[PDB]
Amino acid sequence: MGLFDRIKRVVSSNLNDLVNKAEDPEKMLEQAILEMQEDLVQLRQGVAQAIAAQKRSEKQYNDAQNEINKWQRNAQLALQKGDENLARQALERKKTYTDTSAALKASLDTQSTQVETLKRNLIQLESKISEAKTKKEMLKARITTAKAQEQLQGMVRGMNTSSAMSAFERMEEKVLMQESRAQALGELAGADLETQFAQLEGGSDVDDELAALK
Amino acid sequence: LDTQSTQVETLKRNLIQLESKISEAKTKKEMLKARITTAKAQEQLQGMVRGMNT
């Protein structure tokens, strides 16, 4: 039911956000590296197994290829007594083992191609994981810069946005009001309005003195 | 390495600017603290207007 669909999507949209809430950028990146490295270990284990299988199948081909001559040796040692049937059967078995050796050598070349194309694979993927870790470190440094950076920025007078910055602005406005009051007391008092203006400005006397001395 | 060079230079500029800001802010802090110290006693000592005690 559409009702059930929409109610389920509604319930997922809260777990999803709690999960996004308990996300920490730096700390989280660690797994993205650990698991990559572990599965890299698995992949290189497989690569090694392929290498080993080829290096093991080389055994039978080596046996058969050295045998392609050991059989001539056996045939010679047999005909040295004057028997030709034994040397002839040695030739037949040598032909059999030579066909086996040829098939195994073709298979060995094929596995050589496979292992080289598997060598290229692993080199590329190791390079990728390594460069990825380099980026991981640089970006983790980025995160560490940003985290504190956003608690510390310019002191724009028209915002607080922070603990040490909201304390500063508050005491600043407190300073301003305090000085305003301090000037207000005299501004509120005064011997006479003309006395207040004379206090503000000396008058023609000071202008004349400035002109004369100057 | 060139990309990280750009990053570290843009991170060098960041820190220089923010250090300048905190330093100038401390300068203002000191001057305003002197202001406060002036005012605190200043308001206990002013003209002797005959029409108030205060």
From Swiss-Prot, chain B:
Domain of life, source organism: Bacteria
Keyword Cytoplasm: no
A GO molecular-function descriptor: lipid binding
Annotated keywords: Cell inner membrane, Cell membrane, Lipid-binding, Membrane
Subcellular location field: Cell inner membrane
Primary location group: membrane
GO annotations of cellular component type: plasma membrane
Complex and partners: Polymerizes to form rings, filaments and ribbons. Rings are formed by stacked rungs that tilt to give a dome-shaped curvature. Rings form with symmetries ranging from C11 (55 subunits) to C17 (119 subunits).
Domain comment in the entry: A helical hairpin is formed by residues 25-137 which is conserved in all known ESCRT-III proteins. Helix 5N-5C (residues 193-217) contacts the helical hairpin 3 subunits away and is essential for oligomerization. The C-terminal flexible linker and alpha-helix 6 (residues 220-256) are not required for oligomerization and do not resolve in electron microscopy.
UniProt function note: A membrane remodeling protein capable of forming rings and/or filaments on membranes, which then curve and tubulate the bilayer. Rings will form on liposomes, altering their positive curvature so the lipid bilayer is remodeled into a negative curve as the membrane enters the ring. Ring stacks of varying lengths can be seen joining isolated liposomes. A lipid monolayer can be drawn into the center of the rings. Required for thylakoid formation.
Annotated family: Belongs to the PspA/Vipp/IM30 family.
Name of the protein described by the UniProt record: Membrane-associated protein Vipp1
Phylogenetic placement of the source organism: Bacteria, Bacillati, Cyanobacteriota, Cyanophyceae, Nostocales
Name of the gene: vipp1
